[PDB]
């Protein structure tokens, strides 16, 4: 069983639709879980118990997992490596070892209601 | 782009009344400038450039009317006989006051030019600055300003009278009612100068000073009339 | 905008095979605004006008809720007098309708009686606490009143949270306009005997049995 | 029809600001030609045909402004107070420079007519070619050109300030930013002649030669200002 841990504010249903195409082409089950406090439940469960196979979180929490020895070193071939922006790979690097796969750059913005506020602060 | 977020703009499509109206506003500001003579020599060219301050004041004044027109037809999308009639009265007043404004703007630009000390050219070109002529100056331009705001009040009242046909909601009814009050309050200041000038209490220039001084106290005097109706 | 210009409009419309105004004359709640427009001298003026409409064959003698509603929705009459609840049936029909201020009579406005739709619990019920739960947590809620309102409109709901949606509706504006020109009914026990006295008075004067002066005499007793 | 394939044109529907604006541009080019006197005789008819070269230069100049206006309102579909204000300032500058352009175009057509050897008619009709008058010629038309491009920069900056309200994508943001730079770079050449003429380093015609010579080096001097900002 392939088990993925990703936060509940992300697109786990869409991630499951990718997991459903994977089972069609291989035969492996892809369940997607979203537990509360997974950023601080993963290093406790994954150290002792089994936990997930793959963990999804912003790159900032991964250095602590890498130092503790809770993450496998990523070894992607040049052709896969070349598909992503070289600056994104730098964010997922700890002591000259790739510790994760970069997915997307996130930054907070000001979301505003144009009807209640056309020219916001 | 819009004034109110609660208003549903019925006049987003351009109509003949608005197209005709845009032609008239464009023509008014265009002919105000291009009614001047073509410079034939360097001397005429420098003379013609002294006219830009008077024209800037006239143009600023006309687009402010054009803006109010744009907002009214945007809000209600009206196109009936009475709206056409009131709209024609408006454009008619505008048109008859285009060249008189060119005159007033040139006259006041010389008077304010003398004050600040930029120029020192004669005002004898304008004719005789007598009490009767300076009183008729207030009464004329005062009657012009009063009529424009009076017509905008009548136009908003016509939309208020058709509130149900236009399917106006509680917010839109309130806006329309507020727009009538705004235009009557705007029409009240030139009406008060005009009346003071026509009675002429002092029988001398003092009358014209007071009549002219009500426009400098536009904002405060508008607040007094607005405060009197709210206090009761 | 005035009651007194309806006879002229009706002459104009009857030539084109259409009525001007059809509304429920049987129930006094619909005729009361015209009767109470001026006021007594006001009730005598208002009712005599209503009697003259039936006497001039502008309105039918036994005009009830159903034939008035049906006639307006069919597109036979140009006007009708009704409440929020009636709008949904007009929307169902293909009639571009408008809701507006009631016509004025003798210059002054027609004062309709304002009702507050209200839910009461029967004193002889064992389910008093179950009904309180239904009324509070399920009906008197943004979601509960929306369900009732999409069936047949409630009018200006008592729920504070509905203020903005009510204010966005032009028909509610016209309803509130008439409600301010009218007045809320006292809840007093004598309202039943009062309504019956007005129901008979209006029917007798409409059919042609009792005079307008004799109708207010029997109704004031 | 469109400039960029990545731009989503918000102003495909015609509005009042654009309709009014078209009236003014049409009036400017029309009255420039039709402000002339009607020929009454064969002699006037031949005189009036000498005016087509000056008019072609004026008309070419005005439609180039009209085109920039068309592209701006096509890109953003703007209709707010500040856009109306900047749009009025633009049309105002256009209008005050219509008859002065007719003058400059006739004057330069005689000067270039004398050079090539097509005609040999007098320039004494224009008045006195003195240093002060030839300096005011640069300062006047230089101030006109600077203002038009300055206003186009302010208009694009107003759209940049409303990028989120207009839902501008990364390509459209880039275009808008590039359009501001383009108009400021265009406004920089008349600003540099105007300043050189107003200081007047030589105290003689040499000043006017240099000021006039910056327009012949428009493209190269625009590239220097563009290269200075990219080199840092
Ligand atoms: C504040 C400083 C600015 C003061 C500006 C005062 C301008 O005052 C005004 O100038 C222009 C100068 O062309 C005169 O205008 C004169 O020349 C213009 C030049 O095209 C002719 O169209 C017009 O026939 C003639 O009246 C006005 O008659 C004078 O009243
Ligand atoms: C390059 C070759 C072309 C050189 C063209 C130079 C034209 O120069 C210009 O000619 C026209 C001839 O009508 C003169 O214009 C004159 O006649 C026109 C004829 O309608 C009148 O409107 C105007 O009142 C008068 O000024 C200008 O005052 C002169 O400056
Ligand atoms: O007709 C007199 C009758 O009028 C009022 O009833 C209204 C009711 O309030 C409305 O909701 C509507 O449905 O119509 C009724 C009249 O048809 C009074 O509330 C009632 O006491 C009185 O009998």
Residue numbers in the entry:
A (entry chain A): 123 to 243
B (entry chain B), D (entry chain B): 9 to 240
C (entry chain A): 244 to 282, 302 to 483
Question: What did the authors write?
Answer:
The TMEM175 channel was found to mediate a major K+ permeability of lysosomes and late endosomes (hence also named KEL), and is not related to canonical K+ channels. The vertebrate TMEM175 proteins are composed of two homologous non-identical repeats, each comprising six transmembrane domains forming dimers; the bacterial homologues consist of only one such repeat and form tetramers. We obtained a crystal structure at a resolution of 2.4 Å of a TMEM175 channel from Marivirga tractuosa (MtTMEM175) and in combination with functional analysis, propose how selectivity for K+ ions is achieved. Each MtTMEM175 subunit is composed of six transmembrane helices which assemble to form a tetrameric channel as verified using SEC-MALLS of uncomplexed MtTMEM175.
Finally, MtTMEM175 was crystallized in complex with a Nb that in turn was engineered by fusing an N-terminally truncated Maltose Binding Protein (MBP) to its C-terminus which greatly improved diffraction. We solved the structure at a resolution of 2.4 Å using highly redundant data by molecular replacement based on this novel Nb-MBP chaperone, with structures of Nbs and maltose-bound MBP as search models and could build a map of high quality. The structure of MtTMEM175 revealed two densities attributable to K+ ions, termed 1K+ and 2K+. One K+ ion (1K+, occupancy ~1) in the MtTMEM175 structure, is located at an ion binding site at the extracellular pore entrance. The K+ ion is complexed by eight water molecules in an anti-prismatic geometry that are coordinated by backbone oxygens of Leu42, Ser43 and Ser44. The second K+ ion (2K+, occupancy ~0.5) is not coordinated by water molecules which suggests the permeation of dehydrated K+ ions in these channels. The K+ ion at position 2K+ is located between the layers of Leu35 and Thr27. In the structure of MtTMEM175 Leu35 is occluding the pore to such an extent that K+ ions could not pass. This bulky residue is thus likely constituting a hydrophobic physical gate. Due to the highly constricted pore, the structure of MtTMEM175 thus very likely represents a closed state and this implies that structural rearrangements have to take place in order for the channel to become conductive.
